[PDB]
């Protein structure tokens, strides 16, 4: 098995957010070309999404839980930077982030 914290991040934290009703805009990288966002990569220098986080966890690419938590926080922050605060996608990110912080508060000790 993986370390307690990384296993918890994949089997509890990522799974809970992945299967949430608001997960779908975050399940894959933002395709700025298809979405016609010519400024997205100028504004968002470090893109991140849950599909990438899921692959890193499943392939045991993270060295510790902090690297994974930072990726989730980057994903949320990117959404807040690029979009207007009243927009549906920001409300969705905020609800996912609230759930994320609740599950992170119960991360098992090593």
């Amino acid at each position: 098995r993986q370390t307690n914290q990384l296993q918890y991040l994949l089997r509890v934290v990522l799974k809970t957010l992945w299967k949430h009703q608001f997960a779908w805009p975050f399940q894959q990288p933002v395709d700025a070309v298809k979405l016609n966002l010519p400024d997205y990569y100028k504004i968002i220098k470090t893109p991140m999404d849950m599909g990438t986080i899921k692959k890193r966890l499943e392939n045991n690419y993270y060295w510790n839980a902090q690297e994974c938590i930072q990726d989730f926080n980057t994903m949320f922050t990117n959404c807040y930077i690029y979009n207007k605060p009243g927009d549906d996608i920001v409300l969705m990110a905020e609800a996912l982030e609230k759930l994320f912080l609740q599950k992170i508060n119960e991360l098992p000790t090593e």
């Binding site: 009703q21 779908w24 996608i89």
Partner: peptide, 17 residues
């Protein structure tokens, strides 16, 4: 527009651009 088909054939869209 971001678009998705969710389980149950639920459709959702978001006007990102």
């Amino acid at each position: 527009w971001k678009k998705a088909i969710l389980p149950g054939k639920i459709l959702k869209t978001l006007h990102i651009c």
